[PDB]
UniProtKB/Swiss-Prot annotation:
Biological role stated in the UniProt entry: Involved in the base excision repair (BER) pathway, by catalyzing the poly(ADP-ribosyl)ation of a limited number of acceptor proteins involved in chromatin architecture and in DNA metabolism. This modification follows DNA damages and appears as an obligatory step in a detection/signaling pathway leading to the reparation of DNA strand breaks.
Parts forming coiled coils: none
Subcellular location: Nucleus
Family recorded in the similarity comment: Belongs to the ARTD/PARP family.
Annotated signal peptide: none
Domain of life: Eukaryota
Upregulation: By ionising radiation (IR)-induced DNA damage.
Span within the parent record: 5 to 105 of 983
Protein's recorded name: Poly [ADP-ribose] polymerase 1
Binding site for Zn(2+) 1: C23, C26, H55, C58
Amino acid sequence: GSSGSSGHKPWRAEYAKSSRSSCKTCKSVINKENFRLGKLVQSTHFDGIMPMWNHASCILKKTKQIKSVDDVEGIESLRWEDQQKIRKYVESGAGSNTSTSTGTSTSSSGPSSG
Ligand SMILES: [Zn+2]
């Protein structure tokens, strides 16, 4: 795919228009009409960006994920309650019950089929 829009937000916000995608944090299906989050990670090799699809609640529960609501794209399209989950997460100490962990464990990361 071709494009030309300098600058790209790390996180994305938009209601899933399908139920084919499956979260990575919980490894479940993301039914359409739901608020999810996609962690865009640029690569050095030649390959279409891989948006890490994860329930908006699967990420917010984690720590050191989002810096500010400004980093989230399309966040203005999300429902009020949803938009709050972001700002109310980036402003306040990410995570609850002081539950902080270094990223996520490794799961056969490599030969992943698909
Ligand atoms: Zn999930």
